[PDB]
Amino acid sequence: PSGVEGAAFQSRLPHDRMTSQEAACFPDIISGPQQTQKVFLFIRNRTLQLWLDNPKIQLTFEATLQQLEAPYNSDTVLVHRVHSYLERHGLINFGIYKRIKPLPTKKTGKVIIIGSGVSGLAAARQLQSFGMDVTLLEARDRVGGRVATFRKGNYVADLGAMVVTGLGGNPMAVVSKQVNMELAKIKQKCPLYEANGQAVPKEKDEMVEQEFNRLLEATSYLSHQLDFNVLNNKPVSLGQALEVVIQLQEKHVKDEQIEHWKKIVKTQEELKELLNKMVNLKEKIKELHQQYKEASEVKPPRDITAEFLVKSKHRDLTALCKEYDELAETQGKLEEKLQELEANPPSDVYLSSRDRQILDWHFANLEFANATPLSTLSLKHWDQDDDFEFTGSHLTVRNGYSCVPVALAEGLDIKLNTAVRQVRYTASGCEVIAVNTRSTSQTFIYKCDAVLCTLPLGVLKQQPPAVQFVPPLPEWKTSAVQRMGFGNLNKVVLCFDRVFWDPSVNLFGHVGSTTASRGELFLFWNLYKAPILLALVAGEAAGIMENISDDVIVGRCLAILKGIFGSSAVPQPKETVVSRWRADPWARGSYSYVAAGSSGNDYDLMAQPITPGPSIPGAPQPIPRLFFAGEHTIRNYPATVHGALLSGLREAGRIADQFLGAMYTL
């Protein structure tokens, strides 16, 4: 895709059809006729392209009309609407640009934003770009939330997020141009080093992986074709279904042998029957030779009946030798037809203990992709978003993602070391109570019209809860907070004085010992300029490692590395860090996954805002006062930076339309 159509796709919209939230807004055009539609499409696409083709500068209504032709530039109240919409739902003019027309002196209507992570900020931009009085509350001494980047010396690496998952589709693509994060690609090729310390031969690496893939593909079939989705009331996990598929695989391996041998016998035993038959013929033959012999000893001359006796017994003999020859015949056939079957056995195993342990690394990958035990991912909806996948090479933020949060951060009223305790929302407004994290007996009240909440899943979950809502949250919602998966992932940062790894290699994996520990340090990242290595605590492992001290962890870290590179190619580490996400009282986890017996829908549910009750009773239905975004609210791009950003865009549309009215629907 390119030209105008590229800009649709790059903006995540079908180039030749009207989205549903468009229709929501241009009911006239959509109920309208084809011709009007095609125009509107084009206008939108082009404007998009425009903001695209250069995103460091505000794109104004004027500037836009300016670049259009008739037919299209003819109707100037489309154009103004269209441009107005995008501009509204940060589809254009999002992030960091230069305003042509400085900000409207005076502001309409106050908002408290809870927490200055991407979502949080990317929202607060829009909101104060739309000139409202916006203030973020942030418990941390730092912006970013789950975008941490670590900085000591020229050592620079991310505890939090790290990949940029393609650009073709990516809001982040735009923000890369707006801001100087330095993006280096990522080289697919990852080699593997068995617990011992040695390459897995190209042979295996292929076989096992190819199996792995075949295996998932199989769990899929299981769910879709054979509808394997509940198991005695509990809903099937991905784990479960993997086991089930391996078992059945082992199973058919056996059935194969069994039915192989069971066909040797049936042929061996058809041989028995032939030997007996054949022995008992050497009998009559021997014995009949005798008789003939005798009969022929009786010398001439003879009477005819004795002559006959000879001749008879002669016949009866050759006639019997025929048989033993034609049975010797049959014997040859069946004797070969039997090295034959003993020559091509089935495989004796489905999976060796070497294999089935590598395959256990591939699982630990997946476990990391999802910040969780495959025992927990829903079988049906784990890869629910597998189509909204960007395009092109994944990437790294060589100067350390934090650069982006701190870009957005800028010119934005942010109270840091402010921990929100109560969120009270009534019909006539919200009040938010917070403390100073440093001296916590020291208390803050914030009055506002709306409250936008980015508190990550984790915190929402906390129980007793860290934040109290007043009144309590609609159960439809708390229910969804429960229902939903908040996973976990941790990092080890190894700071050396020299590149001792193959440096044209970005990641290499260590295959662990067990199943119960495939997570533990299973992957290493060479990404940065300096001599720094990334160590991953994935799957089930992560939760436990949080309890081991740092030293020990750097321990098994050196350990493994030595094992791969030589017991003294590997200096002690100058600087080290270890991420303890799940412990982090302002994250309680790393990032959402679709649990089992949850779905896409639950995300949608998280995004839905909360409208209080009426103060005085039977006064009219109030305005929605309490909104949600964060990586957990975005059904289509969950638990990623784009996702969180998109999230906080969306909520800002919605709150502006709310408190400042959508003059663009007429």
Partner: protein, 133 residues
């Protein structure tokens, strides 16, 4: 539509391995043995067939008989008619055997004989006497 090629899954077998916690390993022991028990079975009939085969060592080379090169003559000698009759009595209708025996009369000359001489060798009696055996 179909599961990844070479991976195996039937609705049947699936419900099987999921009927409880360790219906799992049940079906896999149950076969592990079921196999052992077919391996042992295989030894046995190999053994059995081994000895059974030894007993044949020699084949039948002691007992083979030299060849019979000779020309199907058209005349019957009185000698020849005679082995005939007895061949009939002993054999019935196996005209083949009866021809092997006489040695130098073709499988048909035999059948013809069955009729020209039926006359006087009471081939009926001869033949019924054979059935009665």
């Amino acid at each position: 539509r179909k599961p990844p090629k070479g991976m195996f899954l039937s609705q049947e077998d699936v419900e099987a391995v999921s009927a409880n916690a360790t219906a799992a390993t049940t079906v896999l022991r149950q076969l592990d043995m079921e196999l052992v028990s077919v391996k042992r079975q295989i030894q046995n009939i190999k053994q059995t067939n081994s000895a059974l085969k030894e007993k044949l060592d020699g084949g039948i080379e002691p007992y083979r008989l030299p060849e019979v090169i000779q020309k199907c003559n058209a005349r019957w000698t009185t000698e020849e008619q005679l082995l005939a009759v007895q061949a009939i009595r002993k054999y019935g209708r196996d005209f083949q055997a009866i021809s092997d025996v006489i040695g130098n009369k073709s499988v048909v000359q035999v059948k013809n004989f069955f009729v020209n001489y039926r006359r006087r060798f009471n081939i009926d009696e001869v033949l019924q006497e054979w059935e009665a055996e």
